[PDB]
């Protein structure tokens, strides 16, 4: 008896179609961190069966990129303005760990 094959970490490109997106982001450079000392932007809440939950967004995902804007080592307002437009779709690369 043994542990199965499991994904330790990954980088996901996800497409979210939407009045809101269904996420709450937390953290950023200059804000109280979300996990450990990593000051990245993370997904802290996913609306139940919202457009982001249908996209596969998971709680704790780190925002690496939004609509081509690299949000690595970015400030909180930098990711909010990159996600507040969201006319109809947002494409974000995320870092998932376990």
């Amino acid at each position: 008896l043994i542990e199965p094959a499991r994904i330790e970490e990954e980088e996901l490109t996800l497409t979210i179609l939407r009045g809101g997106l269904g996420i709450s982001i937390a953290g950023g450079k200059g804000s109280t961190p979300y996990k450990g000392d990593d000051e990245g932007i993370f997904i802290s809440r996913v609306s139940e069966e919202g457009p982001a939950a249908r996209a596969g967004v998971r709680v704790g995902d780190k925002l690496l990129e939004v609509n081509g804007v690299a949000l690595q080592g970015a400030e909180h307002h930098e990711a909010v303005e990159a996600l507040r437009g969201a006319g109809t779709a947002v494409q974000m690369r995320v870092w998932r760990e376990r």
Binding site: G20, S31, Y34, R45
Partner: peptide, 7 residues
Amino acid sequence: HTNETSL
């Protein structure tokens, strides 16, 4: 409380 923003 640690700076969450709803979207």
